[PDB]
Amino acid sequence: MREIVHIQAGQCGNQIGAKFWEVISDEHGIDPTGSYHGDSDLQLERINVYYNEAAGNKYVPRAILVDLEPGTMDSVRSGPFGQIFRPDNFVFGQSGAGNNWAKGHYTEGAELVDSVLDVVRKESESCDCLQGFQLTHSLGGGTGSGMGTLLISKIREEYPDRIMNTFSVVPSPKVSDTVVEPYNATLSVHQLVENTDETYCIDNEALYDICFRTLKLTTPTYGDLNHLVSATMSGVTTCLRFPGQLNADLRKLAVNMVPFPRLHFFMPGFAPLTSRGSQQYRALTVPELTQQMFDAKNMMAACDPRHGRYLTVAAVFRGRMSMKEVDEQMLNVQNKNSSYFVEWIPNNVKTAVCDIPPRGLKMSATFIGNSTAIQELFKRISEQFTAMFRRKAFLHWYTGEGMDEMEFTEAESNMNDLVSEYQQYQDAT
Amino acid sequence: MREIVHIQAGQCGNQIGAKFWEVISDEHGIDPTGSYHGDSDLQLERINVYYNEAAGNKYVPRAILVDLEPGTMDSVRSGPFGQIFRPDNFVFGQSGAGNNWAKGHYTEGAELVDSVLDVVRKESESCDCLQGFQLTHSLGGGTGSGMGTLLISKIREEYPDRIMNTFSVVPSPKVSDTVVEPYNATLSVHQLVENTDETYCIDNEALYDICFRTLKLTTPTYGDLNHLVSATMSGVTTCLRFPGQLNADLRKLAVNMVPFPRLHFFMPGFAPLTSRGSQQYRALTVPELTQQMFDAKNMMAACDPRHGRYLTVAAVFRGRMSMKEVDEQMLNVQNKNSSYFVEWIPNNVKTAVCDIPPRGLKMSATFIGNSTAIQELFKRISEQFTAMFRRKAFLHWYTGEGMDEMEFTEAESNMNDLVSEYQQYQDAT
Amino acid sequence: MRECISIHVGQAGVQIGNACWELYCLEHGIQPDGQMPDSFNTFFSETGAGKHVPRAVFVDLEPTVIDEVRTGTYRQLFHPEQLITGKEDAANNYARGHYTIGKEIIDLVLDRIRKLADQCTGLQGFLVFHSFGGGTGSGFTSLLMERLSVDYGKKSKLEFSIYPAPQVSTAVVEPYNSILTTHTTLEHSDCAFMVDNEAIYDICRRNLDIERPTYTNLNRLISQIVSSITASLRFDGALNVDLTEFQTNLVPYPRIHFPLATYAPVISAEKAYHEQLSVAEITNACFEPANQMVKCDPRHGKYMACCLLYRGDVVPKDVNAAIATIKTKRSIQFVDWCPTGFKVGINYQPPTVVPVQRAVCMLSNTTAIAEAWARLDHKFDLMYAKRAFVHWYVGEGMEEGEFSEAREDMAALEKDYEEVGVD
Ligand SMILES: Nc1nc2c(ncn2[C@@H]2O[C@H](COP(=O)(O)CP(=O)(O)OP(=O)(O)O)[C@@H](O)[C@H]2O)c(=O)[nH]1
Ligand SMILES: Nc1nc2c(ncn2[C@@H]2O[C@H](COP(=O)(O)CP(=O)(O)OP(=O)(O)O)[C@@H](O)[C@H]2O)c(=O)[nH]1
Ligand SMILES: Nc1nc2c(ncn2[C@@H]2O[C@H](COP(=O)(O)OP(=O)(O)OP(=O)(O)O)[C@@H](O)[C@H]2O)c(=O)[nH]1
Ligand SMILES: [Mg+2]
Ligand SMILES: [Mg+2]
Ligand SMILES: [Mg+2]
């Protein structure tokens, strides 16, 4: 029970799911065809939550693939794990969003949304009990910006109780791959702050850093760039899919963490990370997995916890392990970094211990962090917005789609409303 | 017992029966010759209803083939399943109706009707018990319009209790293959509303749509256009020819459905439908066969149930299946589409479960619908009539055959009498 | 079991028939000797021995062009009782073809019809290849059609005719032919057909890559049209449209029976590539004004009815999308009160070649043809304003007011299309 429906969008977020469902394939023994080959019977006991068991020894990914041009759908279906999906669910347009938020939200967003909302309805009717919806997209492109954000407001009109999480990549701090990355951020900020229950936020540059600092890689591909988020997403629900000594799921992570509904923008953390040969010369145990999390460099969002204040801390472990080896490590590290936290929460460290490791190393941990460090990135992004707005450039596209300045201004004000509230609890102690 | 005599007409309806009797051939193990090769003994137990077992291990199609030019009779007898028929029953004229209703009903209709009404009498005398008569023809051509409608009034003069069903194709909504398609509809409407017990109504364009939307075909032939009606007609009497957990026949479908004898114009529905390879990536079960029926696109008559109101609902299943998997699905879907139905019938869903599937997939369902959506098509057809009548064009052919305006006008008024009555119960609730 | 005989009147119709029956023998594999090394009763009949003869009657008042068949390559094909010659031609005098000479050998040609009508039982149409240019092709045409409605009355009578050109005009009294022949072919012919010489040239020049055409090549274009009209009788397609239906489809009012033929695609040998010729591609080329064979712009009026006779390789759903395009345009527009304006006919037989995949014959009974009569009425007024050439028709027994009786008859003809054009 408590099955989960998967929605994709954009062009970056599809290739992540093109790697993420490969992760879920070997976390359940799923072949590239769709059949079953696992040996551990703990997989089949909760197989239903990410897969419909179709007729005749089949398993299909309960996932909704959405694009606006036939290129990326062709690349998925031709490469690995493309025939595993259902051909009914390759629901995609023909135009391409043109790297415009307004094309993905107003003109071309209204076309394909009806084809999606039946498929959302067909899966939600077919599911016995529904847990929540998940979305993987961009905040820099066109299809990831407008099309995904247009869906979630229609879903909040449908379901009040169902949770919602977007693994949305933050627009980049210093490198500028997108020319109009403020215009794909700020118009996407307003949709995320209203009706997204929890929201995952990953910087681009730290993902380049973690693939270069700890691992010391020379030619990092997107098969190894985007792979770290694929293990990250699996560690969020790894206590759902298998029993544990202390289980967890998506509702336990929500109500523990989010202190007020406008403050729900989180940061990940994963451990352990080695090189190809520099992997045994380290005591890869709980205290090494302890101190690998809490440093500044492990955060996939490029932010310094020293230049900010936390609010809550979640931690999800994998593999069999003891407890006082964990618990004292999950207690003492709050005291060495004592002033970095905030006063008004006793024991803000949420612990979660599954009993199944990844297919690989013996123990693993997934960190879910929340701090006031992220608002300092938005002041750059609000500066990046206003630098392209104090001359009022790039308006005739949105004017051609039809939009006043006030929709730009209030969303920038609502971006500043995020500024006025993460600073508010940071100023408090 | 309860044998059924088959009559054809037109040029479209013959090619349908040229495919339909191929369907009945493998639903009874009948070879292209006329002998028997089946293994399941449930075929031979009720073989008599569509076949006379002739002398010496023979089986002949109890069918009456009628045309007015020797072309289509030559095409049947030369191609497949032409030698299976009796050469005594190829009863056909030599002129061709000229795409005139009045030629098929007044001048040339009086010639070949005497040759048919003995063959109708020779089969009805030979049948032990007679169930009813079935007719497959056009409403756009000449031979399908006049010649078939001239027969049924002579049959209602013969038999009061015997049922009658015409699988008559509706004239096309938007494409205009026939130039005089109102003049072949409106003069054929008056015969159908008087003395046809139930009447099947299929739009051309939705048959193109269902062959293109669900199946995604590139070059659809009439061997695949008209094949969907051939499986449809077989699903009407599939509870007669074989035992079931809840049997049905042509009289049970009549008295359940038709609420008043002037409202008996029905719409079909068939499930399941896949592609050649997109056939396993779906849980082809009862809830998939449930929701495949009730959408607007499955109706072979192009009409929106959202722009109308139902009156009654029949459903015929095939293959072995459970019941609460069916019954709750056949109960709950009345509540989600609650306002689309009408108030004054509790539980308007008639269920019928045979115990023999098609030669092929494991389970199958045939939907028989009745709604007020069809009258909105006639207002187009009455507009198509009056557009060619407000200038009084194309009259000198019917004047050359001999007909006043009042026969055109009262039938148009009787077409409006169909308008005044499907709107009447739709306005009521 | 179904038949359709053919008659050839005048010199211009014979050279049409020389290429027509050239094509028909290549269709069913017939040699010029009536020999072949099933259902083709429409244009042929079988002898006691294995030889087939054409159902054709060749009339002429001059003995010239019939000797070109009596001595030509197609010599042994024809029954010598069919080949009928005169002695003195009408010689571009309509009163000679209608009163002087044609009244003498009228008994022989009409007697040959019933000799052909013995073996015919499904008599479904007549073919009269007559021009309006020559006097023999027009003067005999009026005398011939009067007896047939007395003979049959109910049977079909079709005329694949040749329209006189508004600019490239050979003879002098060609305006005098059309007004006099109007009362016959509007009161006997079930559906006449106009073809102008002038539109054929640019089709030969541009679309056929030969700027200087020959009359042998002008007949090749019309001969492909006549075959594909008979493509439902002589063969079997999924939608066979017989010749009884066309006169019932294309005629909204029994006086309006003047459509125009349009063959497409018309390509050259070197332009057989650089194209794909799909069923949606070629039907837009049908409604192109420079592809039709009548000098009338179709965007100067409205369409009353349209017909499309396909052959080769055709799927109707693929044509269903093609017809949906043409209703959803604006420069192409119909008579509005006729919203069902298409007649589709598909045959699964390829268009044969005379020394491609598919072919389309378009038959569009439209109001664009009505300006061609006004271009010819303007020719006829001034030549009658001088009372020129009256002493030849009156010199061969004709009333002066018989011009004037037929003069207002075109005005009642012209006001038909004007009245149907408005709502
Ligand atoms: N970490 C990654 N970032 C990516 C990847 N591909 C693109 N991007 C980033 O995503 C942003 C571009 O968004 P998309 O790839 O989703 C383009 P999309 O389909 O959403 O819209 P269009 O602009 O209409 O094509 C931009 O900031 C890129 O730097 C990838 O594979 N990994
Ligand atoms: N779904 C199909 N519709 C067809 C088919 N053949 C024709 N038609 C349609 O049927 C109509 C023509 O009617 P018929 O084929 O029965 C011609 P019929 O013998 O009845 O009379 P005539 O006009 O005298 O030949 C017209 O609306 C066509 O579009 C077919 O195989 N399938
Ligand atoms: N379709 C067609 N028309 C032609 C051809 N050659 C000439 N014509 C036209 O035919 C008309 C002349 O008619 P003819 O049939 O030759 O003459 P006729 O009817 O026998 O009468 P006379 O020769 O005057 O006694 C003119 O308008 C010519 O342009 C040809 O090969 N094909
Ligand atoms: Mg993209
Ligand atoms: Mg027919
Ligand atoms: Mg001549």
What is the phi-psi region of residue B96: left when phi exceeds 0, alpha when psi lies from -120 to 50, beta otherwise? Answer: left
Nearest to B281 among A53, A87, A125 (CB): A87
Known binding-site positions of C: 10-12, 15, 62, 90, 131, 134-137, 170, 174, 197, 215, 219, 243
Per the structure block, which two tokens stand in for C11? 């010199």
The closest of A76, A55, A58, A53 to A66, measured between CA atoms, is A76
* Interface touch B175/C323, C-beta < 8 Å: yes
Residues C20 and C141 in one domain: yes
Question: Number of B:C CB contacts under 8 A?
Answer: 86
DSSP C247-271: HHHS-SSTT----BEEEE----SGG
Task: Give the chains touching B; criterion: ≥3 Cβ pairs < 8 Å.
Answer: A, C
The domain that holds C264 is classified in CATH as 3.30.1330.20
Residue in B228, B234, B233, B173 with CA at minimum distance from that of residue B200: B233
User: Could you tell me if C106 and C163 lie in one domain?
Assistant: yes
C-alpha B14 – ligand 2 centre gap (Å)? 9
Q: Is A148 in the pocket of ligand 1 (CB under 6 A)?
A: no
Q: Which of B367, B201, B350 is nearest to B272 (CA)?
A: B367
Q: Last residue of some domain: B207, B235, B259?
A: B259
CATH number of the domain that residue B397 is part of: 1.10.287.600
At C326, list the tokens: 């043409």
Cis peptide before B272 (omega within 30 of 0): yes
The answer to whether the Cβ–Cβ distance between C318 and B95 falls below 8 Å is no
Interface of B with A (CB under 8 A): 275, 277-278, 280-285, 287, 291
Whether residues C275 and C249 share a domain: the answer is no
Angle between helices B12-26 and B70-78 (to 10 degrees): 20
Annotated binding residue B43: no
SS3 at position A400: helix
Residues A391 and A299 grouped into a single domain: no
Distance from the alpha carbon of residue A9 to the mean position of ligand 4, in angstroms: 9
Please check whether residues A235 and A300 belong to one and the same domain. Answer: no
Starting at the earlier edge strand, list the strands of the sheet with C261-264.
C261-264, C359-366, C303-311, C343-347
Q: Closest ligand 2 atom to the C-alpha of B171? A: 27
Going by their DSSP bridges, the two strands A265-271 and A198-202 should be labelled as parallel
Total domain count, chain A: 3
Domain that holds residue A428: 374-429
Contact B309, B339 (CB under 8 A): no
Say whether B283 and A52 touch across the interface (CB within 8 A). Answer: yes
Cα A171 to ligand 1 centroid, rounded to whole Å: 10
Residues 6+ apart with CB under 8 A from B304: B296, B373
Resolution, angstroms, 1 dp: 4.4
Q: Looking at the structure, do residues A221 and A346 belong to the same domain, yes or no?
A: no
Q: Does B94 share its domain with B160?
A: yes
Residue located via tokens 């000594």: A245
Say if CB C133 and CB C177 are below 8 A apart.
yes
CA distance A204 to B201: 60
Nearest Cα neighbor of A8 from A76, A54, A59 is A76
Domain residues for the domain of C379 are: 369-423
Please give the helix or strand (H or E) that residue A149 lies within, else none. helix A148-158
Facing residue for B280 by CB, picked from A58, A125, A126: A58
What is the C-alpha separation between B422 and C118, in angstroms, rounded?
A: 56
Ligand 1 contacts CB of residue A97 (under 6 A): yes
**Do C55 and C26 belong to one domain?**
yes
Q: Which residues pair with A30 in a beta bridge?
A: A36
For the CA of B16, the closest atom of ligand 2 is 31
Domain CATH code at residue B365: 3.30.1330.20
Does residue B104's CB lie within 6 angstroms of at least one atom of ligand 2?
A: no
The Cα A342–Cα A74 span in angstroms is: 49
A285, with CB counted inside 10 A (0-12, 13-18, 19+), is middle
What is the chain B residue with the closest CA to C243?
Answer: B98
Residue written as tokens 């498929």?
A119
Task: Decide: A248 in ligand 1 pocket, CB within 6 A.
Answer: no
- Count of domains in chain C? 3
Burial of A393 (0-12, 13-18, 19+ CB in 10 A): exposed
Mutate to test the pocket of ligand 2, among B137, B169, B187 (most ligand atoms within 8 A of CB): B169
Which backbone phi and psi does A77 adopt, to 5 degrees? -70, -20
Q: Are residues A295 and A345 in the same domain?
A: yes
Q: Which residues of C does the annotation mark as catalytic? A: 245
Contact A143, A149 (CB under 8 A): no
- B220 and B120 in a common domain: yes
The answer to whether the Cβ–Cβ distance between B275 and A87 falls below 8 Å is yes
Within 8 A by CB and 6+ apart from A92, the residues are A65, A66, A67, A68, A69, A70, A72, A73, A112
Of C40, C4, C2, the residue nearest C121 (C-alpha) = C2
Q: Which residues, listed in sequence order, are joined to residue A133 by a DSSP beta bridge? A: A5, A164
Q: Is the CB of B177 under 6 A from ligand 2?
A: yes
The number of angstroms, rounded, from the C-alpha of A319 to the middle of its chain's C-alpha atoms is 23
d(CA C292, CA C296): 9
Q: CB under 8 Å to C182, separation ≥6 — which residues?
A: C406, C409, C410, C413
- What tokens were used for C173? 């009294």
Residue A307 CA to residue A326 CA, distance in Å, equals 27
Instruction: Tell me the CATH number at C132.
Output: 3.40.50.1440
Residue with the two structure tokens 């629900």: A237
Residues of A in contact with B284 (CB under 8 A): 55
**How far, in Å, CA of C84 to CA of C32, rounded?**
20
Give the residue, by CA position, lying nearest to ligand 2 atom 9: B12
Are residues B237 and B273 located together in one domain of the fold?
A: no
My answer on whether A222 and A295 are in the same domain is no
On whether B69 is known to bind a ligand per the annotation, the reply is yes
Q: Is C254 on the interface with B (CB under 8 A)?
A: yes
Alpha-carbon torsion angle B335, B338, B340, B342, nearest 10: 110
Does A179 sit in the ligand 1 pocket, CB within 6 Å? no
- CA dist B23 and A378 (Å) reads 68
Last residue of a domain, one of B206, B237, B259: B259
In this structure, are A182 and A316 located in the same domain? no
What is d(CA A175, CA A140) in angstroms, rounded to the nearest whole number? 12
Give the Cα separation of A239 and A353 in Å (integer).
7
Task: Give which of A234, A243, A270 is closest to A25, Cα–Cα.
Answer: A234
Decide whether any atom of ligand 1 lies within 6 Å of the A109 Cβ. no
Residue C408's CATH number: 1.10.287.600
What CATH number does residue A66 fall under? 3.40.50.1440
Within B96-170, residue ranges assigned H as helices are 101-102, 109-126, 148-158
Answer whether C344 touches B (CB < 8 Å): yes
Same domain, A226 and A305: no
**CA pseudo-torsion sign B72, B75, B78, B81:** negative
- Rounded to whole angstroms, the Cα distance separating A98 from A157 reads 28
- B159 with B72, same domain? yes
Answer with the one of A214, A238, A259 that is the final residue of a domain: A259
Q: Which of C259, C294, C313 is the last residue of a domain?
A: C259
C-alpha to C-alpha distance for A89 and A116, rounded to whole angstroms:
9
Q: CB burial class (10 A; 0-12, 13-18, 19+) of residue A421?
A: middle
Residue B62's identity, in one-letter code, is R
CB spacing of C242 vs B100 below 8 angstroms = no
Q: Is the omega angle on the peptide bond into residue C80 within 30 degrees of 0, that is, cis?
A: no
- Chain B positions in Cβ-Cβ contact with residue A87 (cut-off 8 Å): 275, 277-278, 281
Q: Residues B344-382, buried b or exposed e (16+ Cβ, 10 A)?
A: eeeebbbbbbbbbbbeeeebbbbbbbbbbbbbbbbeebb
Structure tokens at C308: 């499309």
At which of C259, C282, C306 does a domain end?
A: C259
Contact A55 B287 (CB under 8 A): no
- Chains C and A physically touch (3 or more Cβ atom pairs below 8 Å): no
B219 three-state secondary structure: coil
C370-385 helix and C400-421 helix, angle to the nearest 10 degrees: 150
Do residues B144 and B85 share a domain? Answer: yes
B96 in contact with C, Cβ within 8 Å:
yes
* CA angle (A193, A195, A196) in 5-degree steps: 75
Which tokens belong to B351?
């269920």
Ligand 2 atom nearest to CA at B181: 27
